[PDB]
Amino acid sequence: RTTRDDLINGNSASCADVIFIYARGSTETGNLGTLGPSIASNLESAFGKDGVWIQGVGGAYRATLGDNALPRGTSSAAIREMLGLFQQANTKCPDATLIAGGYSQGAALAAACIEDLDSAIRDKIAGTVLFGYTKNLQNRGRIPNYPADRTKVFCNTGDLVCTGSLIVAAPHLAYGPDARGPAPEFLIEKVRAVRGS
């Protein structure tokens, strides 16, 4: 439900084919928050429960609202936590296809982590979804060093964090429909594009 640690808990001898690493928004609970469980249930429908490991970014990422104001839109400690999960995926299951996502501060964290990642691991991420991307204007809707065709950004009209502000208005809390349909749809399509079907 809101905490999933399938990568940390998973047996290396029986790796899933797909590993999804997700970072929640500010002040959200567990390590998946409000949007992560909806994406996870739809990925499990597509690949089966033993076919995909769902991993939230927990540990040092405390999703503190004030850290939205730091240079990269999150803390250095949270970026190091997400790097450690990508490194664990790459070591535990080197043949797995990776996919990623994040909401709000978690979207800035996913973009900062992927920008810093070694290309050999970064290039294994077949698709990334970002909701309420707080660095949308500043990065011109892109994740630095990562292809546009593997990126999908969901930024609502009137969600001020997509236009360079850090004000939280009602459209920022309206990504539920996207997390239920188009965001898992994009991730499944990008995994099948490289894995076949």
Beta-bridge partners for 125: 98
Distance CA 33, CA 175 (A): 12
**Residues 97 and 17 sit within 8 Å (Cβ to Cβ):** yes
Unique residue bearing structure tokens 């540990």: 59
Report the alpha-carbon distance of residue 67 to residue 49 in Å, rounded. 34
CA distance 91 to 63: 26
Following CA atoms 175, 122, 134, 18 in sequence, which dihedral angle do they give, to the nearest 10 degrees? 20
Nearest to 193 by CA among 124, 129, 95, 126: 126
Q: Which residues contact 172 (CB under 8 A, 6 or more apart)?
A: 104, 132, 156, 159, 160, 161
For 52, phi then psi, to 5°, come to -140, 135
Residues catalogued as catalytic: 104, 159, 172
DSSP type of residue 69: G
- For the record, the structure tokens of 57 come out as 């970014």
Domains and CATH numbers, the chain: 1-197 (3.40.50.1820)
| Cα–Cα distance for residue pair 94/15, rounded to 1 Å | 9
Distance from C-alpha of 129 to C-alpha of 133, rounded to nearest angstrom:
10
Task: Report DSSP letters for 88-145, one per residue.
Answer: HHHHH-TTPEEEEEEETHHHHHHHHHHHHS-HHHHTTEEEEEEES-TTTTTTTT--TT
Residue 152 bridge partners (DSSP): 129
Measure the CA–CA gap between 20 and 176, rounded to whole angstroms.
Answer: 18
Q: Reduced to 3 states, what is the DSSP secondary structure of residue 56?
A: strand
Residue corresponding to tokens 């994740």:
143
SS3 59: coil
Distance of CA 196 to the CA centre of its chain: 22
> Which own/partner pairs from 44-52 qualify as long-range (CB within 8 Å, at least 24 positions apart)?
46/184, 46/188, 47/16, 47/17, 47/18, 47/188, 47/191, 50/14, 50/16, 51/16, 51/17, 51/18, 52/16, 52/17, 52/18, 52/19, 52/20
d(CA 93, CA 7): 9
Experimental method: X-ray
> Which residue type occupies 98?
L
Q: What is the phi/psi pair of residue 2, to 5°?
A: -85, -5
Structure tokens at 109: 């964290």
